[PDB]
C-alpha cells in the first residue's frame, strides 16, 4: 500500500520525463511527488532535488529557456534558408548549438542572429 | 594586391572556421586577421567582433569549453553505456545537451553526472 503508493506517483513522474522521482526518491520525500520549488531547481540545474528541501527561497526565472537538439535543429533550419529547406551542414548546426550554450539556454539574440546569417552564408557561397 | 591581400587573409581565417572574417571584415580592420581579442571575443560570444576594438580588456576565460554535438554525443553515449556502445535514445541525448547549456558549454558535473546516470537507468531498465 506504502510501495504501491510511491510507485504509482514515480510512475506519473517518469511519464513526464520527470527523471529524478523514481519510488525512492518519492519514498524519501514523504510519499509526495515533487513540489513546485524543487522541480524548478531540477529543471534549471538537472541536479536531484534534495528530498529535504523545499525551495522556495531558490531564486529563478519564470520563464526557463532551454532548448532540446529538435528544437536547435529547428532554428539552424530557418537561420540557413537552404532550398526546399533540407538539412544544414552539421558545421552551421554546431554553431547555432554553441549559440544556445553561451545564452544557458537561449536563442540567438539580434547580434548572434547576424553572425549566424552570415555564417550560413559563407558555407553556401 | 589590397583586395587579394585582405582576400588571402580571409581565405586563411575561414579555413579555420573563423567565420566572421571576410574580406570586407579584414578590410576595416585594417587589412589584418583579428586580434586575439577579437578571436577571443568571437569564440566566447559569436558576435561580429567590432573591428575597431582590440578587446585586450575584455575579460574571459582562458579555457573557454564550449560542445559540438558530436562532442555532447561522445559524452551522451559512454554516460548511456549500452551494449556494443549504439547510439543512445534522443531523449537521452537532449538531457545530456541541456546539462551543457545549464552549464554554458561545461559538460557535467559530479551532481549531474549522478542525475544522468539515474536518467541513463531508468529508461534502460
Ligand atoms: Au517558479
Ligand atoms: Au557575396
Ligand atoms: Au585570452
Ligand atoms: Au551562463
Ligand atoms: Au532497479
Given at each position: 500500500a506504502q510501495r504501491e503508493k510511491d510507485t504509482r506517483i514515480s510512475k506519473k513522474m517518469e511519464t513526464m520525463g520527470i527523471y529524478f522521482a523514481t519510488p525512492e526518491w518519492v519514498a524519501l520525500n514523504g510519499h509526495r511527488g515533487p513540489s513546485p520549488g524543487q522541480l524548478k531547481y531540477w529543471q534549471n540545474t538537472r541536479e536531484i532535488p534534495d528530498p529535504?528541501?523545499?525551495?522556495?527561497?531558490?531564486?529563478?526565472?519564470?520563464?526557463s529557456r532551454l532548448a532540446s537538439e529538435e528544437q536547435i535543429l529547428r532554428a539552424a533550419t530557418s537561420i540557413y534558408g537552404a532550398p526546399g529547406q533540407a538539412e544544414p551542414p552539421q558545421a552551421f548546426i554546431d554553431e547555432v548549438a554553441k549559440v544556445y550554450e553561451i545564452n544557458h539556454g537561449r536563442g540567438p539574440n539580434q547580434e548572434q542572429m547576424k553572425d549566424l546569417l552570415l555564417t550560413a552564408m559563407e558555407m553556401k557561397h
Open positions: 529535504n528541501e523545499d525551495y522556495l527561497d531558490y531564486v529563478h526565472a519564470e520563464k
